[PDB]
Design a protein around this ligand. Structure first.
Ligand code: 63A
Length: 280
């Protein structure tokens, strides 16, 4: 995987797929010059660093090559910064489970957990801390295949850095580990906490975590030992894995490599671990 540098004439926006603080994402078409191939893409236009700085960051981001991480295919530097990324046809996993909750069986749910863990482990191998993992930021290539994406909170750790110490950026409190909330510390093990919350979202078919609790109250609730409840479809074996992801000591929590193994085992006999009517 290498970074293509794109001219404005090489791609065209087709429609909006979403937007936020980072900017706006469009569905579009990439026609590499002279190549006679139309490639469906998602174009992320951001809302200034020197071009050389932006490119160097884009080069690193484009080297991230894993089946379960959405890849940066190219970049166009004009008045605005535009990132050309793989288009995920089915949108975010959060919307997908909400929509299709009547037709989602244990096999798909457990496979998604495996895939997200595989992607996160790859990021860890690259020393990348995601810092914003949630079902809304997992995208669907096909119902059978999902990819983690990133809208700018991810950080690369230095050779000797074991943690990221954040500044004042706004934070998704209900997905964050307690040490991130209290001390702005982020590690792969804090990503594991967020992973556990993401899995809870899937197992409840897109339900809201800590529903009707103010974000400002979350740290105190977690300090008292309260955690998200066991989803109706979850056997205790699955729930206990989620609970391990939310232990106060980051090194108590499993590693993504260990989560891959445990969920892969469960995905081999899925009806044993998730209880879903009509499944199958
Ligand atoms: C649950 C969160 C959510 O839906 N979004 C939408 C966008 C995602 O931006 C991207 N979308 C897609 N594909 C897609 C979107 N909608 N459909 C029907 C398909 N592929 C992408 N590849 C990279 C980025 C993509 C973000 C938001 F709104 F923040 F921009 C979260």
């Amino acid at each position: 995987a290498l970074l293509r540098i794109l001219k404005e004439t090489e791609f065209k926006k087709i429609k909006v797929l979403g937007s936020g603080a980072f900017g706006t994402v469009y569905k579009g078409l990439w026609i590499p010059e002279g190549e006679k191939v139309k490639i469906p893409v998602a174009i992320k236009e951001l809302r200034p660093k020197a071009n050389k700085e932006i490119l160097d960051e884009a080069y690193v981001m484009a080297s991230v090559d894993n089946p379960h991480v959405c890849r940066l295919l190219g970049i166009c530097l004009t008045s605005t910064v535009q990132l050309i990324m793989q288009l995920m046809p089915f949108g975010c996993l959060l919307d997908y489970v909400r929509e299709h909750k009547d037709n989602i069986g244990s096999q798909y749910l457990l496979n998604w957990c495996v895939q997200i863990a595989k992607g996160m482990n790859y990021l860890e191998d690259r020393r990348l801390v995601h810092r914003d993992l949630a079902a809304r930021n997992v995208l669907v290539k096909t119902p059978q295949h999902v990819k983690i994406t990133d809208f700018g909170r991810a950080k690369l750790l230095g050779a000797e850095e074991k943690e990221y110490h954040a500044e004042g950026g706004k934070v998704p409190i209900k997905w964050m580990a307690l040490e991130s909330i209290l001390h702005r510390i982020y590690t792969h093990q804090s990503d594991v906490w967020s992973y556990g919350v993401t899995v809870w979202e899937l197992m409840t078919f897109g339900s809201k975590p800590y529903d009707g609790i103010p974000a400002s109250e979350i740290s105190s609730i977690l300090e008292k030992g309260e955690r998200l409840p066991q989803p109706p479809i979850c056997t205790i074996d699955v729930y206990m894995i989620m609970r391990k992801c939310w232990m106060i000591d980051a090194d108590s929590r499993p590693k993504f490599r260990e989560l891959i193994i445990e969920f892969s085992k469960m995905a081999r006999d899925p009806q044993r671990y998730l209880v879903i009517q009509g499944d199958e």
